[PDB]
Design a protein around this ligand. Structure first.
Ligand SMILES: O=P(O)(O)OC[C@H]1O[C@H](O)[C@H](O)[C@@H](O)[C@@H]1O
Length: 319
């Protein structure tokens, strides 16, 4: 019968990570825990819509930029976990509005995955650069997500501006658009469809491609030639949370060694962990071995930039 209260989680990681994380939390603390999974941008919209009568306690996973925007928008309540002492320097309080309205639970590398069987069958060379993806031979063979609803897609747009500049990122996207077969509402979906061979190339976070590989899909991960970007996975307590103590406990736990290791050991989710005492997945990428930009979480997690960039992308690129 009686348990130790409730926790309602709006999750934006994969369903597998969401399920493994909330299950392990629930079983440890005997908390009646539920979750729903939605894209990072979709989740922001939901929390904004529900702000007068909040339905969830915590927002777990997904990219940090929408969570940073929420903090700026007074949709979150700040909570500084003791566990932050164990979080890698530089990642302890990374959002636009400081004071840990949001905290960083993982790091994911942006890139693309390539179905080598499909390209080989079609006599199409494997691409290795972002710039390759605009070439004639990839028309109809690319899937990417939509930054209106997906955190991944916004991370990509932000990464192209930081690799290059804003006009050439948008010029890039105009050319890329001609080759896109589908814009997906969540970030993981291109990994699923490139794995099954419906399209040859998915743009997204590389650990989702590692998982598909591990399941037998003929995928090859590419960290592209020009360099690339990354997400921080966020955790945030929702302002007006009904179950506030269990929310704080959840934040403490998912920032801990124990909570983070559940993601790859039980949730099949191979992001880089931000806790300095956590065992890293042998399947995780090592950032020091990659050409990474220094992603400006503060500017791209600013509300005016999110809205300006996403509006410009819908207007100029998607139409
Ligand atoms: O792009 P979204 O739907 O917002 O999801 C973003 C999330 O998607 C993936 O599938 C990754 O496993 C997560 O590392 C990422 O944070």
């Amino acid at each position: 019968s009686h348990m130790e209260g409730r926790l309602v989680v709006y999750c934006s990681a994969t369903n597998a990570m969401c399920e493994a994380g909330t299950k392990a939390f629930a079983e440890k603390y005997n908390v009646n825990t539920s979750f729903v999974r939605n894209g990072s941008g979709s989740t922001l919209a939901k929390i904004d819509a529900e702000k007068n009568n909040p339905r969830a306690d915590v927002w777990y996973g997904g990219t940090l930029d929408p969570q940073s925007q929420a903090g700026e928008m007074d949709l979150l309540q700040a909570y500084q976990s003791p566990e932050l002492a164990n979080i890698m320097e530089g990642f302890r309080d990374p959002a636009k509005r400081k004071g840990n309205y949001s905290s960083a639970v993982y790091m994911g590398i942006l890139g693309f995955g390539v179905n080598t069987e499909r390209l080989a069958q079609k006599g199409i060379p494997i691409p290795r650069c972002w710039a390759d993806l605009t070439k004639p031979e990839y028309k109809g063979e690319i899937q990417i997500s939509d930054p209106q609803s997906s955190g991944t897609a916004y991370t990509a747009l932000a990464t192209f501006i930081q690799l290059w500049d804003e006009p050439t990122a948008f010029e890039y996207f105009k050319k890329l658009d001609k080759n896109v077969s589908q814009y997906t509402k969540s970030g993981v979906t291109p990994s699923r469809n490139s794995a099954r061979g419906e399209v040859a190339i998915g743009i997204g976070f590389l650990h989702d491609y590692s998982l598909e590989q591990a399941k037998g899909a003929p995928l090859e991960l590419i960290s592209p030639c020009e360099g690339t970007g990354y997400e921080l996975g966020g955790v945030s307590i929702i302002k007006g949370a009904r179950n506030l103590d269990n929310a704080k406990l959840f934040v403490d736990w998912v920032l801990s060694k124990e909570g983070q290791e559940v993601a790859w050991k039980q949730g099949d989710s191979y992001q880089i962990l931000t806790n300095t005492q956590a065992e890293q997945s042998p399947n995780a990428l090592d950032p020091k071995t990659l050409k990474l930009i220094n992603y400006d979480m503060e500017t791209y997690g600013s509300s005016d930039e999110r809205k300006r960039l996403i509006t410009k992308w819908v207007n100029e690129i998607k139409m």
